[PDB]
Design an enzyme around this catalytic site. Structure first.
Site, PDB file in Angstrom:
ATOM      1  N   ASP A 220      -2.727 -34.559   9.564  1.00 28.88           N
ATOM      2  CA  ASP A 220      -3.130 -35.159   8.301  1.00 28.88           C
ATOM      3  C   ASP A 220      -3.861 -34.162   7.401  1.00 28.88           C
ATOM      4  O   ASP A 220      -5.093 -34.038   7.448  1.00 28.88           O
ATOM      5  CB  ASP A 220      -4.018 -36.372   8.614  1.00 28.88           C
ATOM      6  CG  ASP A 220      -4.335 -37.211   7.395  1.00 28.88           C
ATOM      7  OD1 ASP A 220      -4.072 -36.767   6.254  1.00 28.88           O
ATOM      8  OD2 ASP A 220      -4.858 -38.329   7.600  1.00 28.88           O
ATOM      9  N   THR A 221      -3.109 -33.473   6.554  1.00 27.53           N
ATOM     10  CA  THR A 221      -3.692 -32.433   5.702  1.00 27.53           C
ATOM     11  C   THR A 221      -4.648 -32.995   4.637  1.00 27.53           C
ATOM     12  O   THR A 221      -5.509 -32.273   4.129  1.00 27.53           O
ATOM     13  CB  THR A 221      -2.600 -31.573   5.019  1.00 27.53           C
ATOM     14  OG1 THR A 221      -1.736 -32.402   4.231  1.00 27.53           O
ATOM     15  CG2 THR A 221      -1.778 -30.814   6.068  1.00 27.53           C
ATOM     16  N   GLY A 222      -4.497 -34.278   4.314  1.00 30.92           N
ATOM     17  CA  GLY A 222      -5.392 -34.968   3.394  1.00 30.92           C
ATOM     18  C   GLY A 222      -6.686 -35.474   4.007  1.00 30.92           C
ATOM     19  O   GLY A 222      -7.479 -36.119   3.314  1.00 30.92           O
TER      20      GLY A 222
HETATM   21  C1  LIG Z   1       1.495 -45.889   2.500  1.00 33.97           C
HETATM   22  O1  LIG Z   1       0.891 -44.785   1.821  1.00 33.97           O
HETATM   23  C2  LIG Z   1      -0.387 -44.358   2.100  1.00 33.97           C
HETATM   24  C3  LIG Z   1      -0.849 -43.161   1.555  1.00 33.97           C
HETATM   25  C4  LIG Z   1      -2.150 -42.710   1.827  1.00 33.97           C
HETATM   26  C5  LIG Z   1      -3.008 -43.444   2.655  1.00 33.97           C
HETATM   27  S1  LIG Z   1      -4.503 -42.922   3.005  1.00 33.97           S
HETATM   28  O2  LIG Z   1      -5.072 -42.255   1.880  1.00 33.97           O
HETATM   29  O3  LIG Z   1      -5.347 -44.019   3.417  1.00 33.97           O
HETATM   30  N1  LIG Z   1      -4.526 -41.899   4.284  1.00 33.97           N
HETATM   31  C6  LIG Z   1      -3.787 -42.447   5.442  1.00 33.97           C
HETATM   32  C7  LIG Z   1      -4.387 -41.961   6.766  1.00 33.97           C
HETATM   33  C8  LIG Z   1      -5.856 -42.359   6.934  1.00 33.97           C
HETATM   34  C9  LIG Z   1      -3.556 -42.476   7.935  1.00 33.97           C
HETATM   35  C10 LIG Z   1      -4.162 -40.491   3.984  1.00 33.97           C
HETATM   36  C11 LIG Z   1      -5.329 -39.565   4.360  1.00 33.97           C
HETATM   37  O4  LIG Z   1      -4.901 -38.200   4.282  1.00 33.97           O
HETATM   38  C12 LIG Z   1      -6.534 -39.821   3.456  1.00 33.97           C
HETATM   39  C13 LIG Z   1      -6.406 -39.236   2.037  1.00 33.97           C
HETATM   40  C14 LIG Z   1      -7.710 -39.453   1.279  1.00 33.97           C
HETATM   41  C15 LIG Z   1      -8.091 -40.728   0.878  1.00 33.97           C
HETATM   42  C16 LIG Z   1      -9.302 -40.918   0.213  1.00 33.97           C
HETATM   43  C17 LIG Z   1     -10.133 -39.845  -0.073  1.00 33.97           C
HETATM   44  C18 LIG Z   1      -9.762 -38.567   0.329  1.00 33.97           C
HETATM   45  C19 LIG Z   1      -8.558 -38.374   0.995  1.00 33.97           C
HETATM   46  N2  LIG Z   1      -7.783 -39.209   3.923  1.00 33.97           N
HETATM   47  C20 LIG Z   1      -8.810 -39.901   4.421  1.00 33.97           C
HETATM   48  O5  LIG Z   1      -8.800 -41.108   4.637  1.00 33.97           O
HETATM   49  C21 LIG Z   1     -10.063 -39.127   4.705  1.00 33.97           C
HETATM   50  C22 LIG Z   1     -11.076 -39.566   3.636  1.00 33.97           C
HETATM   51  N3  LIG Z   1     -11.721 -38.310   3.299  1.00 33.97           N
HETATM   52  C23 LIG Z   1     -12.964 -38.291   2.644  1.00 33.97           C
HETATM   53  C24 LIG Z   1     -13.337 -39.395   1.872  1.00 33.97           C
HETATM   54  C25 LIG Z   1     -14.569 -39.423   1.247  1.00 33.97           C
HETATM   55  C26 LIG Z   1     -15.464 -38.362   1.382  1.00 33.97           C
HETATM   56  C27 LIG Z   1     -16.804 -38.409   0.709  1.00 33.97           C
HETATM   57  C28 LIG Z   1     -17.192 -39.665  -0.001  1.00 33.97           C
HETATM   58  O6  LIG Z   1     -17.564 -37.444   0.763  1.00 33.97           O
HETATM   59  C29 LIG Z   1     -15.112 -37.270   2.163  1.00 33.97           C
HETATM   60  C30 LIG Z   1     -13.875 -37.238   2.801  1.00 33.97           C
HETATM   61  C31 LIG Z   1     -11.072 -37.261   3.759  1.00 33.97           C
HETATM   62  O7  LIG Z   1     -11.328 -36.075   3.621  1.00 33.97           O
HETATM   63  O8  LIG Z   1      -9.950 -37.709   4.546  1.00 33.97           O
HETATM   64  C32 LIG Z   1      -2.541 -44.643   3.187  1.00 33.97           C
HETATM   65  C33 LIG Z   1      -1.248 -45.102   2.918  1.00 33.97           C
END
Ligand SMILES: COc1ccc(S(=O)(=O)N(CC(C)C)C[C@@H](O)[C@H](Cc2ccccc2)NC(=O)[C@@H]2CN(c3ccc(C(C)=O)cc3)C(=O)O2)cc1
Lengths: 99, 99
Positions: free
Chosen positions: B25-27
């Site tokens: 998970d690069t995000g």
């Molecule tokens: C169906 O399509 C979808 C696309 C994307 C998602 S998702 O965003 O929930 N998610 C799914 C995963 C958890 C299985 C993708 C992750 O890469 C998702 C992308 C993202 C969302 C929100 C903020 C930052 C980054 N990453 C994360 O959940 C975490 C949150 N996060 C983060 C969030 C907040 C903070 C703060 C407040 O400092 C610091 C870090 C982070 O670095 O990674 C879910 C479903």
């Protein structure tokens, strides 16, 4: 290009006169963009991650440029804190994970 | 390996002698695993996601073998929707995005 992951993989994207920074996100099935008033038809959807679900609007066949690469596909628009380029578009610009 | 993105980049990991499937998970800044038992000291922490914030347990300096590549680092345990390998460990195993 090769993007290391020492920092967040943020790149510049273009969607209709708005340039935005977005994450190249291999953990995201779909592309999720911050709230913007796009033209065209859409359908409501819920997507879930850490913390729970958010409500988004699904727009289809939206052209988007990502680091100068052309893409076109579904984009989900809603109250995400970050713009997220998901696998649906990462494949279109030829993006792979390598180690 | 080279991993394409038409399917979720799920890989087998080994942690505490147990095999699990996790999402590359690069995000994600941080590695977050679903509820499990790990030995040693932990600290309560809170992390954010797309849908809000959750409580997790922070375990430091934990070995995980990720698709045959060794890492030792921080593992957060809590109500993530799926096991995710974040950049803190992706960097350790030499993972880059390429297009
Ligand atoms: C169906 O399509 C979808 C696309 C994307 C998602 S998702 O965003 O929930 N998610 C799914 C995963 C958890 C299985 C993708 C992750 O890469 C998702 C992308 C993202 C969302 C929100 C903020 C930052 C980054 N990453 C994360 O959940 C975490 C949150 N996060 C983060 C969030 C907040 C903070 C703060 C407040 O400092 C610091 C870090 C982070 O670095 O990674 C879910 C479903």
């Amino acid at each position: 290009p090769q993007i290391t992951l020492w920092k967040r993989p943020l790149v510049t994207i273009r969607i209709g006169g708005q340039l935005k920074e977005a994450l190249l996100d291999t953990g995201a099935d779909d592309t999720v963009l911050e709230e913007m008033n796009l033209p065209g038809k859409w359908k409501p959807k819920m997507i879930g991650g850490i913390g729970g679900f958010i409500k988004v609007r699904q727009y289809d066949q939206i052209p988007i440029e990502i680091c100068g690469h052309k893409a076109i596909g579904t984009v989900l628009v809603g109250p995400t804190p970050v713009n997220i380029i998901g696998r649906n578009l990462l494949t279109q610009i030829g993006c792979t994970l390598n180690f």
